[PDB]
Paper text:
In humans, the CALHM family encompasses six paralogs, some of which function as non-selective channels that are permeable to large substances such as ATP. We identified the three paralogs, CALHM2, 4 and 6, to be highly expressed in this organ. The CALHM subunits thus constitute unique modular building blocks that assemble with different stoichiometries into large membrane channels. In contrast to previously described CALHM structures, where the oligomeric state of individual channels was described as uniform, our data show heterogeneous populations with CALHM4 and CALHM6 assembling as decameric and undecameric channels with similar abundance and CALHM2 as predominantly undecameric proteins with a smaller population of dodecamers. Despite the unknown activating stimuli, our study has provided insight into gating transitions of CALHM channels by showing two conformations with either a cylindrical pore of uniform large dimeter within the membrane that is constricted at the intracellular side as in case of CALHM4 and a conical pore that continuously narrows from its extracellular entry towards the cytoplasm as in case of CALHM6.
The cryo-EM density of the decamers extends to a resolution of 4.1 Å and undecamers to 3.7 Å, which in both cases permitted the unambiguous interpretation by an atomic model. Both assemblies contain pairs of CALHM4 channels of the same size related by two-fold symmetry that interact via their cytoplasmic parts. In the plane of the membrane, the dimensions of decameric and undecameric CALHM4 channels amount to 110 Å and 120 Å respectively. The diameter at both entrances of the pore measures about 52 Å and 60 Å for decameric and undecameric assemblies respectively, thus defining the properties of an unusually large channel, which could be permeable to molecular substrates. Even at the constriction located at the intracellular membrane leaflet where the respective N-terminal helices NH project towards the pore axis, the decameric channels are about 20 Å and undecameric channels 30 Å wide. In our data, we find strong evidence for a layered distribution of density inside the pore within the presumed membrane region in non-symmetrized maps and after application of symmetry. This density is observed with similar properties in decameric and undecameric proteins in both datasets of CALHM4 obtained in either absence or presence of Ca2+.
Residue numbers in the entry:
A (entry chain D), B (entry chain C), C (entry chain B), D (entry chain A), E (entry chain E), F (entry chain F), ...: 4 to 83, 94 to 280
Write the structure that this text describes.
Amino acid sequence: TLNNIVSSLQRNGIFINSLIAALTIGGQQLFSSSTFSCPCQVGKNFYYGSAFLVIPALILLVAGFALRSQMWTITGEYCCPLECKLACLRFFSITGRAVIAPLTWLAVTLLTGTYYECAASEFASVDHYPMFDNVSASKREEILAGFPCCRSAPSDVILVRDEIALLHRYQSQMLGWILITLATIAALVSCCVAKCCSPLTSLQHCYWTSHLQNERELFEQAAEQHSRLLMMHRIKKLFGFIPGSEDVKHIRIPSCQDWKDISVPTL
Amino acid sequence: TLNNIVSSLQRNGIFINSLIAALTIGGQQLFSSSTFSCPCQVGKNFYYGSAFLVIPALILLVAGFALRSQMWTITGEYCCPLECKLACLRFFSITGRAVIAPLTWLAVTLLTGTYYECAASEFASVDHYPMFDNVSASKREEILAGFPCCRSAPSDVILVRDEIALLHRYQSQMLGWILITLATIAALVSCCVAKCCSPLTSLQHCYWTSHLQNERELFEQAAEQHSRLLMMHRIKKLFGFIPGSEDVKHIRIPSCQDWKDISVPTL
Amino acid sequence: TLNNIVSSLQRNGIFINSLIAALTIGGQQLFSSSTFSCPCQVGKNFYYGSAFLVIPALILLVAGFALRSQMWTITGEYCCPLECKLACLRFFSITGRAVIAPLTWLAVTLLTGTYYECAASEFASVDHYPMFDNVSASKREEILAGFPCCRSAPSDVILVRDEIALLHRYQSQMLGWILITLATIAALVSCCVAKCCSPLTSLQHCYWTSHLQNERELFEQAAEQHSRLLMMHRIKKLFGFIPGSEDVKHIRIPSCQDWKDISVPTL
Amino acid sequence: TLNNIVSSLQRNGIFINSLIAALTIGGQQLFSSSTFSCPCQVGKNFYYGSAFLVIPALILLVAGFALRSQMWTITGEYCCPLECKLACLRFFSITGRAVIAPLTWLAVTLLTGTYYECAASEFASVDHYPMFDNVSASKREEILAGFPCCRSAPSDVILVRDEIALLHRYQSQMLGWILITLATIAALVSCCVAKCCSPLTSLQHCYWTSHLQNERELFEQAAEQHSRLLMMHRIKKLFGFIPGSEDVKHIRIPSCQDWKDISVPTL
Amino acid sequence: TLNNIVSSLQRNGIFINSLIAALTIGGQQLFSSSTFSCPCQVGKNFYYGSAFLVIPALILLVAGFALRSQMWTITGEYCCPLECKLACLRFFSITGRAVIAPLTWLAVTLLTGTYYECAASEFASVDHYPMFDNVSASKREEILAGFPCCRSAPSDVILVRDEIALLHRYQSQMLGWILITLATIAALVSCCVAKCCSPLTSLQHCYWTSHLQNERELFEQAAEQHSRLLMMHRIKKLFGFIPGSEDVKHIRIPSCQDWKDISVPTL
Amino acid sequence: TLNNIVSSLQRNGIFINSLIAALTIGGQQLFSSSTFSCPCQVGKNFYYGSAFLVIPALILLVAGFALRSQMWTITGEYCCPLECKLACLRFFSITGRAVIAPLTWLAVTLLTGTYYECAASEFASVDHYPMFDNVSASKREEILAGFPCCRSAPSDVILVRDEIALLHRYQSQMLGWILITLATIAALVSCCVAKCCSPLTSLQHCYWTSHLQNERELFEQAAEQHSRLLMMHRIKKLFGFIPGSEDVKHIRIPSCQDWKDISVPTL
Amino acid sequence: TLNNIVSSLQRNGIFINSLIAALTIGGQQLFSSSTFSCPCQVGKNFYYGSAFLVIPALILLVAGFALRSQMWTITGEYCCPLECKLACLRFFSITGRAVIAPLTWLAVTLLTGTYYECAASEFASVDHYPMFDNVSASKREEILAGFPCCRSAPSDVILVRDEIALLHRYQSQMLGWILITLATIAALVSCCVAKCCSPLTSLQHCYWTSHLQNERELFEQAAEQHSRLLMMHRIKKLFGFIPGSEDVKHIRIPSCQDWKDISVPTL
């Protein structure tokens, strides 16, 4: 009964996607909490924030594609009629499974806002501030590059610092919501177009998916068993008894040519 | 006996709806407690409050529609007599299941009132207040935009601040109740009209719903088994034995054309 | 033996009603403790108290009616001799089950008294108080509207405040008892009239109720099984084997017209 | 063996009565501890104490009568020889079960004495007290109405207050004992008269009570089963198979008139 | 059922790789936390940081290759047509398993950044610093070599120290991301080329891998059993009974030449 | 099933080696923590550090060789063609098992560095230090010999002390890494040469190892049983019954010569 | 299965030796911690340290020899060809088991060093110390005899005391290592010579040891059973029934001579 509910969960797309999203959230939380500190330099703040913001998204997307064995088969079909559309639909389902990780990472990282502040702490528009008039441009880049990591300046500076930080957090969370909404809308219209383009009815589709899963599992079982039987026959020929046999009555001593023979697997 | 009560709960619309509502409430509580802070800017306070207030409602509604497989089938029927009314009724039941999430999120978020204060902290009507007479309009937008996040001004300011906050909380909770009542009334009249328009009697309807559930489960079971049998026959033809067979007496070595053959699934 | 006592409790009207009442009490306690604060405005105090006092009662009553499936059947009978009286009696039992929630909520909320103080904190009769003579009417509405939420005024004000609060709590609890007594008396006379009007004897009534419960459960079981058998025959016709069969000897490959055929359920 | 001792307790009148009394005591304790505060007004103190003292007694008595199904049957007999006396005896046993709740509530509430002090804190006889000579009658009602809730006056006032409180507690507990004794004596003489008037011997009575319990349970079992059999026959006629049957060989498709037919239950 | 899921995990490449990565991370954390301290010398800081950075990577890579028994067989094939490509593919899978450890160690050690600071604390570009103008070159190497381990100098020195440390941490984490991205991209293009060059189809490949695993396990089982049977026959010849036999009736005392005989195993 | 996984672990070389390494690490940690203190003499510091560093390595190596029973058999073969190479390979496997302990002890003791500081605290190169110019050579050996155990001198001395200690820890850990790398490289090239020199194929080798293990276990079982049977026959001859027999009917009293006879075991 | 692994451990020489060593270590630790205090006399310090150092070693060695029953048999053989060498080998194995205790006790006691300091605290070479020049020889023995137990003298004395204590601890631990190395080397060369001198091959030896163990256990079982049978026959003769018999039909009353007879056991 345990394996019953195990497979029943395995089929559930919702459970697998929720697990992927929860794992991404937790991993991102730990990762940010431990290994994130702003450089607080002048030219290198941007790249530092954008790397954490973007790179793991690409990594996780490429992982979500490459870790699906079915993707390799469909690529082999493409790599050097109806079948084209069916391949497109399988690749579509693969994309649906894979895309959940980069977008959840991006959404949680933007909603938290910590990365964005560091990423765009130099682009702050400072035109109506009383302390920044006299300061030289280079000195301006220096004072502007210090705000996110820490505060050591007088109270007026920490005031303007907190105001800029609040503005940038707002911008970050707004980007997060724009991305969430755009992604859900795109996924909806994409499922709509996929259903519209499908040459199958609503019943043939279920038979199709079941056929795919059963076909893969059955061919792997059969191939493994047939190979084992052939190997067991090669060994019975060489030694003179079947490996599983009990109380074998005839044993054949191998010669010096038989070893040479069984060296090669005949593919 | 466990799966007995599991399916018995699965049928219960009341239990599923209560679970959806409890999960939405808890998720909203955590979400608000962790990632909510007002920008306390001048033009950007509104959008920030309205995003949290509205966007997750749209997200959850689109989710409640799209996650129901039956909706995809009915759309396929619509996508390029009595059947039209039956499709309308199924889509109606789907809507009934889906609508519970956005309205519970909206009701709990309005009753709590925290989002509304930030959302409409600029529109405060300040005409009979003694400190706001002399202040310039821009300075007025600046002092008005600071009240929700924190208080650093003298005691008179914190007094007027607390009064405005109480007024806005009142308005929020009133909107919450208006929405709850309007939604329940609309749901009631909608179920009434649906029952009135139904061409079925009170008994044919039960037979209908049972037929729908049984039809879907049975066709998926049958299709999966038939596909497995056909695949098991293709493998018996290629290898020479049935994958489940024990003590197979005849094994056929595949040729170089058979692999080419079994490459294609014949759809 | 577990399901034995489970159904035995399910039949018990007393247990179900006690559970409904306990759940309403607990929910009201939590709800009031968390999301209740007085606006302490001038015109908006009343509506705020009356909403919490009244709206959930209407909500819970409409819920207690609409969540009973039998009510839908009786409405369908009414919706576009002896049977009329029997329908009246069933609807009466439904009302008996449903009414327990709004009245328990109202009784507990009035006995607690917290809502009533806020609801009617403006209507206080202030004619024999020494501080309210000179105060202007608008200023009077302002001082009167502040008493429930908090006290910041001198000791004389907190004295008169506590006195008004005690008077209003008294009025609230008295209303609570009047409502409890009126409701119990009405329920008693209503059960009396229902028994008096019943055209059945004391024995035919038991047979009647048992007939109703058995009729509903049996027709749902039978209809579900018959639909499953018909579906299993349609699938045997299409595929060539019965879904439950083991070691099927004849498999029929479907054609391109059979899929079209089984697309429609024949209702 | 569990249901054995469960029914054995169910028969025990002593256990059921002890449970009712313990539940009433605990409920009264919680109720008084949470929702009881004196108004400390002038004209409204009395009604406030008398409501808590009396109303729940009436409520619980009407509940103890109305919750007994047998009472409904006997009323139906009365509602529009030996049988009259037997009905009187059944109604007598019902009264014996019902009366335990109001009298236990009254006894515990009077023995505690908290309600009585508030109920009769205005009627105090103040004729030999040195501070009450000069005070005007209205001022006297004001000072007299403040004693129970709290003490803020000088030490002489708190002295006379504590003395009045002790006197009223004494009166309350004395009333409690008078009520307990009167109730037990009345119950004793009432059981005596009931035994004296009973036209049955000491053995016919046991057979009678057993007959009543067995008659009710048996008729409900039989009626339910007979109704189920008749319903199962109506369904066999409509569908063509009995709902419990396994491997049904003949299935009859219903026509459009059969649904109309089975719509009505034939009562 | 335990060994079922044990082997099912054993097959999972993802689980084994995740376990290797987690173990490497934990071991690196402990190792760095306990046995890492900078020498804070002048010429020897570099080698000290580069050893920890690089050497364990080489060690773990050579371990990941050498601990795979299959690698020894393929090397024996190489050591003094289609088979060459198949050997290349097996060696490729071995590389895929092995490479996960050195790159995870390098990535975690660079992302942490502690090693890099010590490794390149001498190469700091000091051209625009006010305290380093006058200092002699040798004294410069001395002050520059002290920053990572500890701070004892005045506040200006600890300021410039913290700035250099932040710059070097930035450079380290950037190198970490460059390495992660380059490694994932190389692995992707490498799997692509391997799939492109594979002379097998998508089905022959599964049969191939299953054949390899079954062939190895079966030949080891068979060889062990055959050797045991031959040994049991040599012992039956020498002693006169089979080691497992019960109630042996004939025992042969060995002579002084038989011991000489059984001394040699005949290979 | 327990003994199943017990033997399966017993075969695992990796598990046994990991256990040996963990035990060596823990034992070394305890040993160093409890019984290690520097003498802080002048001529005797070196020997004291080198003993702990080196002696347990020799001890553990000789133990790893001598505790393997197979080593005794191969030595007996050597002690006063193909067989020589096979003996070399067995001795090689023994060495592979044995070498893991001394090198792990050496690596952990060097990486920790505590022993090395004491071992080479006299050889410190003191040529560019301001306090050591004037001090006489003997006094120099005295001040130099005190640094590791404790510090009682002024702050300048503890400064130079900490610097020397850091330098020596660096040298120790560098030696540790050099030893680890040299050992792994030597083990790799040694396994390579052993595989290259092996006159067996990749399959004959598995049969060989299995033959060795089975041969040893079987001959010990057979020899023990045969000896027991012969002894049981000597006792049956002397006493007149077989030791395991039940309900022996004939008992023979031994004479005074039989005891003399059974005194000798006939070897 | 429990006795299976119990005997399997019993055979393991390594487990028994490890247990002996652990028990000796723990016992020595407790013994030293509780009952060890230096006399701090002049002539009696030496004997006190040497007793604890040496005597328990002799005790434990004599115990390890005398507690082995096989040693008694071999001594009986010696006490008033090939057999001499076989006896030598058995006595050798006994020595191997016995020697582990005295050497572990000596090694742990020397490595700890506490005993040695007390044992040789008088022999300290005091020739280059400034306080010991003037002191008279007897006074020198008095000051020298006080250092180990406690310190009450000025700081210069505690300095020279700690230095002497460190020197003596060094000497102790060096002796410990010399003893460990000498013992392991002697054991190795001794096992080598024993294997070299053994007239048996590598297989006859296993048969020999198994024969010895089986011979001892079997003769004890047989002798016990035969004696029990003879005793049971003497009792059957005297009483007239066999002690284990059930429902004995014939009972013989003993006479006054039979008691005299059964008094003697006939040896």
